[PDB]
Design a protein around this ligand. Structure first.
Ligand SMILES: O=P(O)(O)C(Nc1ncnc2sc(-c3ccc(C4CC4)cc3)cc12)P(=O)(O)O
Ligand SMILES: O=P(O)(O)C(Nc1ncnc2sc(-c3ccc(C4CC4)cc3)cc12)P(=O)(O)O
Ligand SMILES: O=P(O)(O)C(Nc1ncnc2sc(-c3ccc(C4CC4)cc3)cc12)P(=O)(O)O
Ligand SMILES: O=P(O)(O)C(Nc1ncnc2sc(-c3ccc(C4CC4)cc3)cc12)P(=O)(O)O
Ligand SMILES: O=P(O)(O)C(Nc1ncnc2sc(-c3ccc(C4CC4)cc3)cc12)P(=O)(O)O
Ligand SMILES: O=P(O)(O)C(Nc1ncnc2sc(-c3ccc(C4CC4)cc3)cc12)P(=O)(O)O
Lengths: 337, 337
């Protein structure tokens, strides 16, 4: 596995990431820097690192091996960790706003004794660390500004996505397909799928607008597919297999499932849905599920997967050049659950 | 007044700022953009605009009038508003973290019905808008990257400052002068005093490290002075004159007053302080005040002002060149209350 190959080195680099972000020529910010260390250690560690690793895998596939000096790699690892820091920023903040209890098999940072709403500042520090790292490791590089702009834009797009999600889910009237597709695109797909390849692209000197537009077209369609899958597996997944015990229905999400359900429902079924969506009790969660089954949404999903395979293989056929197909295909394999 | 002269045009530009940040080639983010308009309108408007205006005043004092085309000015106004957007980001967030009720004579944004902790995202959008504006108005300019780095660094320094404030005020043991001075420097002085002049400097082609270090030396010392004044006036100000009804003691702040009080107190006075600092009731707030009076902290302040005048005039004498002294002196006059 091309990701398993890169992994150990990527994770070991985290140690260096931290050292450099904390190491006291100015003594009396010491205490704040110590808090910064704790924030990084708790929140940047424990994921699958798919997004950060994608930077490293893509880098290796896109830069001729004659230009993979010890130093270029340090940079690749660093930029990968920059993506992981972006993720951490979003998730610390998202947990506060959703009033979540747990994340990545542990108490959400803001819920830890004596953190609370101070986590808002902590989240912002994580974001800040992106640009500090980019400066320290890539200031002299020709792609420096490209990377700054890409990260800032990725942040902007994600935040806009979050705004749309927040407005959409404060009433099922609002849960349309055009709306669902739009949330997924801004809120997850840009920073999860486009950003990591795009970074690698810029680090490899592939900076053209067309090349970027082409990679983007593939990657946003991949990101939509993987989010829709995520929505399906939330309910009909086997949690021992996926790792997620679904709570989308209780949590009242604009999920792909509900959108499809809404499109198909008779007026009376709308009512059963209006009646049971977003409740604690299993009794009710089971009536929503049983409705999705009644409307045969798994078959609808299966069909969506089949269609979606053809479309995405075709997209890569057409739009991958002059990147290696394996960049796209390697990422698909890694994310698919 | 050089600020009153620039003001009407600066504030009128806000309209343009908004238009450009909202104007629907992508239709289905419409609703999110509408929310963005509301966030800007509520949170970026109603201050004195000292920091944003400083960019515009400094620009005019630093660029020869032959290079003050309609376009250079648009840019100056825009960059000024970028400082105002940074301020707004910090304050929306700070209000959430402090659990404040009011700001700028109105309900804090997060306290408005149906905003709540969604304000966290809103705060981040305000930050994002800085870099969108910088791109739209200054991408082709030679100082573009300088401005990106300055804003990102200003954010980093402020956040670090906030971390230090949060750690320092979660116990009077912690309220030392080295610590107080350090909070003020990172949390307020860099972005309130250095950032706006520095931006103008870069827009004028003054990009040298020495020149920046020199401006910085003056401006951080100015920022310390104005924060210490702010602390004094919180208690001994006349609120009808200043506009602030002080609540530093109740709110348990690391204020200059308490630091000085701590340095002077006998063991028994420490106890009266330990006993009354951070309470609701006036009875107790009056015993803290009466102690500061007992220890004659106003005289200590007066002396601090006198010393501080000589020092800062001397700093400008020595370090202002090749900037016009009036940049520094104009800002002092404007902020002094
Ligand atoms: O209550 P305030 O606003 O008068 C005052 N707060 C501030 N005054 C001046 N500048 C700043 S910058 C600042 C801050 C707050 C939150 C953040 C979070 C985004 C990370 C960053 C900076 C708070 C603050 P304080 O009495 O808590 O010291
Ligand atoms: O994962 P499987 O083999 O158990 C099964 N998967 C599929 N079954 C039938 N047709 C298809 S097409 C498909 C697929 C996989 C990857 C992609 C990636 C390019 C995005 C697109 C479609 C998975 C799949 P399901 O239990 O998720 O329904
Ligand atoms: O297990 P199978 O083959 O009988 C069948 N699976 C499939 N049938 C038809 N086409 C496909 S494509 C497919 C697949 C799964 C994972 C991937 C990962 C590289 C992304 C790609 C394609 C599974 C599958 P299903 O009855 O479990 O849905
Ligand atoms: O609960 P989760 O984390 O599984 C999920 N949230 C997310 N999943 C994937 N990507 C993202 S990016 C995102 C977000 C949250 C807060 C912000 C605030 C800083 C502005 C920005 C982005 C939330 C999120 P959802 O079930 O609320 O959709
Ligand atoms: O403002 P005033 O005239 O009523 C009086 N101000 C002063 N009185 C005596 N000495 C001084 S030195 C001083 C000053 C003003 C501006 C500065 C700016 C360069 C930072 C530094 C020191 C104000 C002042 P106070 O009521 O604040 O004590
Ligand atoms: O009103 P005053 O002159 O009798 C006396 N004020 C001063 N005495 C001696 N030196 C100075 S310098 C000073 C001042 C006030 C505002 C400024 C603003 C430009 C920043 C500068 C200097 C007021 C002052 P105070 O008894 O009110 O403290």
């Amino acid at each position: 596995d091309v990701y398993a190959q890169e992994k150990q080195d990527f994770v070991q680099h985290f140690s260096q990431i931290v050292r450099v972000l904390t190491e006291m020529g100015h003594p009396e910010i010491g205490d704040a820097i110590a808090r910064l260390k704790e924030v990084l250690e708790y929140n940047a560690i424990g994921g699958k690192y798919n997004r950060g690793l994608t930077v490293v895998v893509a880098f290796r596939e896109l830069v001729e091996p004659r230009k993979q000096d010890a130093d270029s790699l340090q940079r690749a690892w660093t930029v990968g960790w920059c993506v992981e820091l972006l993720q951490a920023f979003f998730l610390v903040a998202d947990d506060i706003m959703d009033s979540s209890l747990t994340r990545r098999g542990q108490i959400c940072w803001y819920q830890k004794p004596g953190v609370g709403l101070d986590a808002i500042n902590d989240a912002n520090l994580l974001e800040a660390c992106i640009y500090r790292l980019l400066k320290l490791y890539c200031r002299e590089q020709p792609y420096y500004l490209n990377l700054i702009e890409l990260f800032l834009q990725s942040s902007y797009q994600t935040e806009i996505g979050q705004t749309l999600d927040l407005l959409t889910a404060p009433d099922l009237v609002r849960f349309t397909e055009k709306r669902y597709k739009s949330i997924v695109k801004y809120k997850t797909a840009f920073y999860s799928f486009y950003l990591p390849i795009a970074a690698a692209m810029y680090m490899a000197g592939i900076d053209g607008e067309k090349e970027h537009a082409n990679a983007k077209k593939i990657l946003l369609e991949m990101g939509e597919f993987f989010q829709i899958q995520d929505d399906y597996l939330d309910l009909f997944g086997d949690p021992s297999v996926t790792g997620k015990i679904g709570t989308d229905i209780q949590d009242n999400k604009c999920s792909w499932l509900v959108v499809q359900c809404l499109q198909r429902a008779t007026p009376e079924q709308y009512q059963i849905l209006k009646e049971n969506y977003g409740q604690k009790e299993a009794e009710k969660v089971a009536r929503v599920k049983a409705l999705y089954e009644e409307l045969d949404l798994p078959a609808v999903f299966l069909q969506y997967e089949e269609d979606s395979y053809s479309h995405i293989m075709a997209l890569i056929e057409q739009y991958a050049a002059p990147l290696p197909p394996a960049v796209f295909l390697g990422l698909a394999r890694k994310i698919y659950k």
